[PDB]
Amino acid sequence: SLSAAEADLAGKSWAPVFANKNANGLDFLVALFEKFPDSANFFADFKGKSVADIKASPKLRDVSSRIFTRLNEFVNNAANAGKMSAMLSQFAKEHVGFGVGSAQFENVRSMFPGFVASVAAPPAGADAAWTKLFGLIIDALKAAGA
Ligand code: HEM
Numbered sequence: 001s002l003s004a005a006e007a008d009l010a011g012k013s014w015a016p017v018f019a020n021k022n023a024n025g026l027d028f029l030v031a032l033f034e035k036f037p038d039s040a041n042f043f044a045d046f047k048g049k050s051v052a053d054i055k056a057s058p059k060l061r062d063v064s065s066r067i068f069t070r071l072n073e074f075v076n077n078a079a080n081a082g083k084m085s086a087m088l089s090q091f092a093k094e095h096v097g098f099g100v101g102s103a104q105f106e107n108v109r110s111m112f113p114g115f116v117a118s119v120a121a122p123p124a125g126a127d128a129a130w131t132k133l134f135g136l137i138i139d140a141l142k143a144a145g146a
Helices: 004-019 021-035 037-042 051-055 060-077 081-098 102-117 126-143
Strands: none
Touching: 004 021, 004 060, 004 102, 004 126, 021 037, 021 051, 021 060, 021 102, 037 102, 060 081, 081 126, 102 126
């Protein structure tokens, strides 16, 4: 886990993003696919398709939402190793099932801070809190076999 301090910083930077959940959740998903095109392949309707096709999809919102709703729960529990344990196991177990592994989260990690910053400048130290949090995610993926 993260320390309460770290956790606070991550929450603080997240607040503005989550404020506009629907629009921001969609933008995050699109930004990922733009920066890391290979990632669209892990999704049926999105593979073959262009970012423009994705943006136009009636499925976008359902996909990106689930992502934001879970991230929010990770942000909430970050400083409680216990909750994280369980959350991390279940998250990795689910992704590996789909063929997604840490390399994909290394990508998320890479572009995350920049994404948050495009919404509102984060507090000092928030960038490191997210990398740490994504770190926890990457490690869980590696333990789950990918
Ligand atoms: C930012 C971190 C991410 C969060 C918190 C997250 C969260 C989620 C959640 C909670 C589900 C289950 C949705 C449901 O209830 O049906 C899910 C499904 C899945 N995720 Fe992630 N995800 C993230 C990153 C990624 C990445 C990077 C990829 C691919 C590169 C990935 C690919 C998938 C796939 C293929 C599914 C299966 C669901 C489907 O077929 O639509 N996710 N993820």
